Amino acid sequence: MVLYFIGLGLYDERDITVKGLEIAKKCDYVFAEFYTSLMAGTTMGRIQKLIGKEIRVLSREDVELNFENIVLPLAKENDVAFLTPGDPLVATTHAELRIRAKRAGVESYVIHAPSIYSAVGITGLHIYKFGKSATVAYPEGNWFPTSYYDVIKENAERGLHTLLFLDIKAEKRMYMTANEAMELLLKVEDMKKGGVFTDDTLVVVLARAGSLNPTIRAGYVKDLIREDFGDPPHILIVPGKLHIVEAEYLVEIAGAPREILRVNV
Amino acid sequence: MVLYFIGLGLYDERDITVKGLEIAKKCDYVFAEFYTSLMAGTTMGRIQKLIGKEIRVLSREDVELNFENIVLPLAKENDVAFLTPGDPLVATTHAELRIRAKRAGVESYVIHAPSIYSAVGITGLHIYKFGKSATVAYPEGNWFPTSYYDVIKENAERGLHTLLFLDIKAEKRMYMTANEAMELLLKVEDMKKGGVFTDDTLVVVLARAGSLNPTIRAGYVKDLIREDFGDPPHILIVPGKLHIVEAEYLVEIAGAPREILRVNV
Ligand SMILES: Nc1ncnc2c1ncn2[C@@H]1O[C@H](CSCC[C@H](N)C(=O)O)[C@@H](O)[C@H]1O
Ligand code: NA
């Protein structure tokens, strides 16, 4: 009679850890949410088939407002699993659900899975050099979010790389592309004019990490802003000062202009 | 003709993903390295039994100096797997190994797995608030390194969390304990006196991330410095100012003192 938070990983149903699969297979009830991220290489059927259990999908409202009414009650008399894309506690507010479980007398366990936060390593940028992260959110009505622009500025001044999670509106099947994120950032630049994000800014795009052939591209905004990086999900990265081997990787593996091999120490 | 970089995950042999396991089983040759880290919850034998292939272990020198003479030759006429703890390419020098593959006319693919960079989300600390990461190294001889102290300073100064990796002697199987890390930092604080790490500093200790029963403890240095966090490996985190939700999780899940709800928020 416990609750398991089990990550499903980056791209398809095979990105779940063996540990997660074995445990998921032996749970009495299986719940899941697919609004915090997008697993572009799988479907509900494939996941249900792999786990061998019927999966009840919950909405953001079901979770944020009724987790303790839909999931926890069952976690008292049975073993329950709650599945999520990537790692369940990364760039989500799911950690708080563990507090709800405790207060309801339910013990919980977390089974990790590969996350986009560490998968950034495939870009060649040293992961320890990443600074504060941020999310490029879709403007809504007259409200136009811009704090993420300041994060980049803060990190850049320190020579640190900036990881930019991109917005997602699962109910509308909307997945922000790196292209759209670049557009929004250029608009904020005109606004603030801090010289933080312009056509000459070097950026890195990682799309569909977890698949065997993810799209990894590096170059100047003026050149990538209109490039096609394939289907979502995408993440955008604004590197800080580059190490020679980081630049070499971006050129050799990500197709960056050979000129970035020259670093301005 | 193909080299697969496969992550083994966090703690035991089941932390590898289903994708990683199936691919490894289809490879003609399987190599592994355990100098960047060492699965404390398993053994070479258990990993070997799980994959069903003999696993040739490579030293740091085998990889860094001879990757192209040991692994790549076989990758030309067979499918080869290179196993590493955590997520492949997180370790700073691994990314360039892909450049070596390319240079040798060998295609490479990356199979991700849980990394400590994302697993620390289990501490309840928001992932986006983490800043630059660092490693606490043992002083020795006339060398007393202290850069990790400066990292904590720059991060905390901006309200960001600092993820600290603790020194490890893979060969001698010696792990630096969180307790030892604190002592070193207090000693560095006495040296630099910047008001960065003192007895009143709040810290979080994560041990055996990945296992079903990890150790998650949060508190002030004066109380945790002599606490027993169990067997390695230990990860230390110096949080920046907390979001009430982070503090609540640390209190309810990591046994942190109520005091953080008013002092560190
Ligand atoms: N496979 C993938 N490839 C590229 N970006 C990804 C991705 N998975 C997640 N993301 C990025 O992260 C956002 C979701 S944020 C939630 C992240 C998740 N808990 C994890 O551990 O990965 C997406 O909108 C996208 O910008
Ligand atoms: Na980081």
Side-chain angles (χ1 to χ4, degrees), chain A residues 9-11 33 35-40 84-92 94 113-119 135 164-168 175-176 206-211 214 232-236, chain B residues 118:
Chain A
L10 305 165
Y11 190 68
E33 61 90 351
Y35 65 76
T36 54
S37 187
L38 171 65
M39 290 186 77
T84 75
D87 178 296
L89 311 182
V90 175
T92 66
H94 292 327
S115 168
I116 185 63
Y117 194 70
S118 70
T135 298
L164 298 169
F165 290 100
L166 303 193
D167 214 350
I168 171 180
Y175 311 103
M176 185 185 283
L206 174 56
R208 305 179 309 290
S211 66
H234 298 357
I235 53 160
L236 182 62
Chain B
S118 49

Side-chain angles (χ1 to χ4, degrees), chain B residues 71-147:
Chain B
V71 181
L72 300 192
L74 289 174
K76 260 300 187 180
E77 288 282 58
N78 316 80
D79 281 329
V80 180
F82 175 56
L83 315 177
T84 73
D87 188 10
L89 278 79
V90 158
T92 307
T93 63
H94 288 5
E96 88 81 51
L97 296 179
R98 296 197 76 202
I99 297 175
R100 300 196 204 189
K102 187 187 177 191
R103 293 290 174 64
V106 176
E107 307 176 65
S108 70
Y109 300 87
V110 177
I111 310 305
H112 299 283
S115 166
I116 192 65
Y117 270 98
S118 49
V120 289
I122 198 169
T123 63
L125 295 174
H126 304 328
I127 288 293
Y128 80 91
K129 289 178 66 181
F130 278 82
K132 184 180 183 178
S133 306
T135 297
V136 178
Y138 280 114
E140 32 193 49
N142 300 293
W143 203 245
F144 200 98
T146 65
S147 76

Side-chain angles (χ1 to χ4, degrees), chain B residues 148-163:
Chain B
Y148 53 86
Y149 173 92
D150 298 324
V151 171
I152 298 171
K153 185 181 182 298
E154 295 303 297
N155 284 334
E157 188 175 304
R158 297 167 170 70
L160 305 178
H161 309 317
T162 300
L163 178 59

Side-chain angles (χ1 to χ4, degrees), chain A:
Chain A
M1 52 182 274
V2 303
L3 167 65
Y4 289 107
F5 285 91
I6 305 173
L8 291 180
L10 305 165
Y11 190 68
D12 55 62
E13 74 291 338
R14 293 203 299 161
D15 294 322
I16 182 178
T17 62
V18 169
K19 177 171 293 166
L21 183 58
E22 311 287 54
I23 295 179
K25 278 178 173 175
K26 300 305 180 182
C27 287
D28 305 302
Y29 291 92
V30 176
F31 297 89
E33 61 90 351
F34 291 96
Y35 65 76
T36 54
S37 187
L38 171 65
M39 290 186 77
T42 187
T43 68
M44 205 51 52
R46 295 177 185 174
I47 301 175
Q48 276 186 171
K49 188 179 179 184
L50 176 62
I51 299 178
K53 301 283 188 180
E54 170 191 296
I55 300 175
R56 180 185 169 179
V57 182
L58 306 174
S59 67
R60 179 185 287 278
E61 177 181 294
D62 292 324
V63 180
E64 282 175 34
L65 300 183
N66 293 117
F67 194 70
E68 60 272 58
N69 295 143
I70 300 171
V71 183
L72 296 189
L74 294 173
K76 267 292 187 177
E77 294 292 297
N78 309 297
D79 275 44
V80 186
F82 179 54
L83 321 180
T84 75
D87 178 296
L89 311 182
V90 175
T92 66
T93 50
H94 292 327
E96 187 279 320
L97 301 177
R98 296 201 69 196
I99 297 177
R100 299 193 197 177
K102 184 194 176 187
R103 295 181 184 174
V106 177
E107 295 300 298
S108 66
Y109 299 79
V110 179
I111 310 306
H112 299 104
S115 168
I116 185 63
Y117 194 70
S118 70
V120 299
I122 198 172
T123 63
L125 296 168
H126 301 336
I127 194 173
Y128 72 88
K129 285 177 64 182
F130 275 71
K132 183 177 183 183
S133 301
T135 298
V136 177
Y138 279 119
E140 35 185 52
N142 299 148
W143 214 67
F144 197 124
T146 67
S147 65
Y148 54 82
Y149 172 96
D150 301 321
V151 169
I152 295 173
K153 184 174 185 173
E154 179 189 299
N155 285 335
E157 303 183 316
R158 293 216 284 158
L160 306 179
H161 311 315
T162 303
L163 171 59
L164 298 169
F165 290 100
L166 303 193
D167 214 350
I168 171 180
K169 302 293 184 177
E171 302 204 316
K172 294 185 174 183
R173 291 186 176 176
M174 295 187 79
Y175 311 103
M176 185 185 283
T177 58
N179 308 80
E180 294 181 294
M182 288 185 245
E183 294 287 1
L184 287 167
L185 276 158
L186 289 173
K187 285 188 175 66
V188 181
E189 176 57 49
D190 286 309
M191 276 282 287
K192 301 183 180 300
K193 299 178 174 300
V196 178
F197 198 84
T198 77
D199 288 313
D200 299 306
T201 300
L202 173 71
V203 301
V204 182
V205 174
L206 174 56
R208 305 179 309 290
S211 66
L212 275 287
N213 296 292
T215 297
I216 312 176
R217 291 275 302 114
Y220 304 116
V221 175
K222 68 193 186 186
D223 298 314
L224 281 62
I225 189 163
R226 274 176 167 290
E227 194 179 324
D228 180 20
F229 305 110
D231 300 323
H234 298 357
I235 53 160
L236 182 62
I237 294 170
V238 179
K241 189 167 70 292
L242 298 173
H243 266 71
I244 275 53
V245 73
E246 290 180 311
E248 299 184 307
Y249 186 102
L250 294 184
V251 168
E252 294 290 330
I253 306 299
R258 296 195 68 72
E259 62 195 60
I260 78 160
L261 286 178
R262 295 195 299 288
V263 182
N264 294 305
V265 300

Side-chain angles (χ1 to χ4, degrees), chain B:
Chain B
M1 265 296 283
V2 179
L3 171 61
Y4 289 103
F5 287 80
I6 305 178
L8 292 180
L10 306 160
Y11 189 68
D12 55 64
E13 76 290 336
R14 293 196 301 165
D15 291 335
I16 184 179
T17 67
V18 171
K19 177 179 296 165
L21 178 59
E22 305 191 325
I23 287 183
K25 285 184 175 179
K26 294 181 180 182
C27 290
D28 307 296
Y29 295 99
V30 184
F31 298 86
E33 63 90 358
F34 283 94
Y35 60 84
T36 61
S37 178
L38 219 170
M39 334 279 300
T42 190
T43 68
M44 194 59 47
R46 290 176 178 175
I47 296 173
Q48 184 160 281
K49 176 58 185 297
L50 172 65
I51 300 181
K53 301 271 189 178
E54 69 175 66
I55 300 176
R56 175 175 171 182
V57 184
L58 302 179
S59 64
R60 172 192 287 290
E61 180 176 292
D62 288 335
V63 175
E64 306 188 319
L65 179 66
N66 296 304
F67 197 68
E68 57 267 54
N69 312 310
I70 301 173
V71 181
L72 300 192
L74 289 174
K76 260 300 187 180
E77 288 282 58
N78 316 80
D79 281 329
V80 180
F82 175 56
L83 315 177
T84 73
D87 188 10
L89 278 79
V90 158
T92 307
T93 63
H94 288 5
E96 88 81 51
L97 296 179
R98 296 197 76 202
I99 297 175
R100 300 196 204 189
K102 187 187 177 191
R103 293 290 174 64
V106 176
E107 307 176 65
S108 70
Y109 300 87
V110 177
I111 310 305
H112 299 283
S115 166
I116 192 65
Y117 270 98
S118 49
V120 289
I122 198 169
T123 63
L125 295 174
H126 304 328
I127 288 293
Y128 80 91
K129 289 178 66 181
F130 278 82
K132 184 180 183 178
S133 306
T135 297
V136 178
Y138 280 114
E140 32 193 49
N142 300 293
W143 203 245
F144 200 98
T146 65
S147 76
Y148 53 86
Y149 173 92
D150 298 324
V151 171
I152 298 171
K153 185 181 182 298
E154 295 303 297
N155 284 334
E157 188 175 304
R158 297 167 170 70
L160 305 178
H161 309 317
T162 300
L163 178 59
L164 299 169
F165 289 90
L166 307 188
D167 209 333
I168 181 181
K169 302 300 179 183
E171 319 71 54
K172 304 175 183 179
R173 300 187 63 77
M174 179 195 277
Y175 307 71
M176 177 193 271
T177 73
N179 308 80
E180 295 179 290
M182 294 184 236
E183 292 281 23
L184 263 182
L185 280 157
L186 286 178
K187 199 176 184 180
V188 180
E189 173 59 47
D190 195 57
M191 295 283 281
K192 293 184 178 299
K193 298 173 182 175
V196 183
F197 195 89
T198 72
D199 282 293
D200 299 313
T201 299
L202 173 60
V203 299
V204 182
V205 173
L206 179 56
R208 300 184 307 291
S211 73
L212 296 183
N213 303 95
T215 286
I216 312 172
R217 291 281 300 109
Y220 300 115
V221 177
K222 57 189 177 63
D223 299 299
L224 279 60
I225 195 162
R226 303 189 201 70
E227 190 177 327
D228 179 55
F229 305 110
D231 290 303
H234 294 173
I235 282 300
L236 181 62
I237 296 164
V238 178
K241 172 186 160 187
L242 305 168
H243 163 29
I244 192 63
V245 179
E246 291 177 305
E248 299 184 306
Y249 182 107
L250 290 182
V251 167
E252 307 293 310
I253 304 300
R258 294 177 300 182
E259 193 182 328
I260 71 164
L261 297 174
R262 55 164 180 280
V263 175
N264 310 90
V265 172

